[PDB]
Design a protein around this ligand. Structure first.
Ligand SMILES: CC1=CC(=O)CC(C)(C)[C@@]1(O)/C=C/C(C)=C\C(=O)O
Ligand SMILES: [Mg+2]
Ligand SMILES: [Mg+2]
Ligand SMILES: [Mg+2]
Lengths: 161, 305
């Protein structure tokens, strides 16, 4: 929990979503660590471009699919601990209403139904846009994150069989 | 019995709009169109009479085109089978509540198609499939118009719209299922969901409509239950306009009606689909492009007179 304890100010909101996955942690992490290919598990991503190798400070340009409140987002890699399985990303651009969005995703070992499994936790802190409440912003972000972690679980478990 | 269909990807990267035009897709039990008393007056109430019907459909897909295409391929088959079965049951009722029966047959049809899409029921492909057709975040609007000699029956599910150009006045045969609707907001919030203003009113701040086929990741807030409107045909009726929001977001009902009627009359005075109605649909599509739409555009025009 020490990695998902943000200190939000009153004009912001912060929350977290979790997902249990019936797959070993190094497979799920092998998926999550591909900073250049978020479409690997994000259902809303249609295209992603990134220049150079993946390093702290790398910036990917993401295009999302139809039926969404936005089309593109510019996201920078803030942290990638390979052995601790920690990925932290900050939104730095795009045409969306998620200003100062920062997220931390951690992958942990866990026994599920007697078999090797994975606990994924993703927390975030974001500025509440003008006109919305905290509950609305956190609800919207939690919905997108829940979809992303559900898809990550399905792709990870399909890669085990 | 005469229509034209214009459809373009437009200024978009992908095509996720689909449409259907199936003539004689089914035989409608006449007891769904006339009361048993008016038919008994002509002695046409003992056996099971049937009147052939045509089906037109527009399906605005999002997150992909798989669900829209599937609706185009399946909705008319399922609806035809359902009407066929209901024909063997209308004769067992002293008085037929026609509107409730249309609502039930379209609701069961749309729910069946949605269950096939989500994988809750199996589907026939000599082979059977049970997995979902596509990802949970893929969905589609569905507006269908059953046209027959006596009535037009409209089933709407989403923000695509159909307009009847009647006389000097356009009559909307479907109300857009945007989540900001008072009854739809009441339903969604009553189920524990949220309607959030996030670049438009959206379910959970994500989807800009409250009803669609598929989109199982937003259930039970997004439902595939359609709203049905039964309208009798009159000699005032000129044409039907079925379109996705690629037209309605930039063209109003009145402008679409006057433009389509003028284009049909112009083609007729100057001179399988119909050439005049096709000219009307093409004119509407290119008019939506000219106004500045960056969306997929699908327009079906059905000449009634
Ligand atoms: C799906 C989508 C819709 C938006 O309105 C904003 C944005 C384009 C940023 C987003 O891609 C959001 C992505 C989020 C919250 C998390 C992620 O995927 O890591
Ligand atoms: Mg679409
Ligand atoms: Mg619209
Ligand atoms: Mg559209």
């Amino acid at each position: 929990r020490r990695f998902h304890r943000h200190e939000p100010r009153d004009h912001q909101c912060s929350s977290a979503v979790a997902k249990h996955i019936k797959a070993p942690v190094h497979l799920v992490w092998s998926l999550v660590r591909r900073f250049d290919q978020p479409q690997l598990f994000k259902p809303f991503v249609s295209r992603c471009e990134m220049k150079g190798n993946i390093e702290i400070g790398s910036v990917r340009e993401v295009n999302v699919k139809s039926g969404l409140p936005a089309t593109r987002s510019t996201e920078r890699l803030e942290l990638l601990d390979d052995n601790e399985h920690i990925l932290s990303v900050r939104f730095v651009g795009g045409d969306h209403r998620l200003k100062n969005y920062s997220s931390i995703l951690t992958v942990h070992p866990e026994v599920i139904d007697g078999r090797p499994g994975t606990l994924v936790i993703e927390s975030f802190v974001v500025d509440v846009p003008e006109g919305n409440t905290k509950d609305e912003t956190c609800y919207f972000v939690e919905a997108l994150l829940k979809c992303n972690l559900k898809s990550l679980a399905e792709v990870s478990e399909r890669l085990v069989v | 019995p005469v229509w034209g269909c214009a459809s373009t990807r437009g200024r978009s990267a992908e095509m996720e709009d689909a449409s259907a035009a199936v003539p004689r897709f089914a035989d409608v039990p006449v007891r769904l169109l006339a009361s048993r008393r008016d038919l008994d007056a002509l002695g046409l109430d003992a056996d099971a009479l049937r009147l052939p019907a045509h089906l037109f459909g527009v399906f605005d897909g999002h997150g992909g085109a798989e669900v829209a295409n599937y609706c185009r391929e399946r909705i008319h088959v399922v609806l035809s089978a359902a009407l066929a079965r209901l024909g063997k049951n209308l004769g067992e009722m002293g008085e037929v509540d026609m509107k409730e029966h249309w609502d039930d047959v379209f609701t069961k049809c749309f729910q069946r198609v949605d269950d096939e899409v989500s994988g809750r029921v199996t589907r026939v492909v000599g082979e059977v499939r049970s997995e979902p057709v596509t990802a949970e975040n893929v969905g589609s609007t569905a507006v269908v118009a059953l046209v027959c000699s006596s009535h037009v029956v409209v089933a709407n599910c989403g923000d695509s719209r159909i307009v009847l150009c009647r006389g000097k006045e356009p009559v909307a045969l479907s109300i857009d299922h945007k989540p900001d609707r008072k009854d739809e907001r009441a339903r969604i919030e009553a189920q524990g969901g949220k309607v959030i203003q996030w670049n438009g009113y959206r379910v959970s701040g994500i989807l800009a409509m409250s009803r669609s086929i598929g989109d199982r990741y937003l259930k039970p807030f997004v439902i595939p239950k359609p709203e049905v409107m039964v309208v009798p045909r009159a000699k005032d009726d000129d044409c039907l306009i079925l379109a996705s929001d690629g037209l309605w977001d930039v063209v109003s009902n009145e402008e679409a009606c006057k433009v389509a009627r003028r284009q049909i009359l112009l083609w007729h005075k100057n001179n399988s689909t119909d050439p005049a109605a096709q000219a009307a649909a093409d004119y509407l599509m290119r008019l939506a492009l000219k106004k500045g739409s960056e969306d997929n555009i699908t327009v079906i025009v059905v000449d009634l007179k």
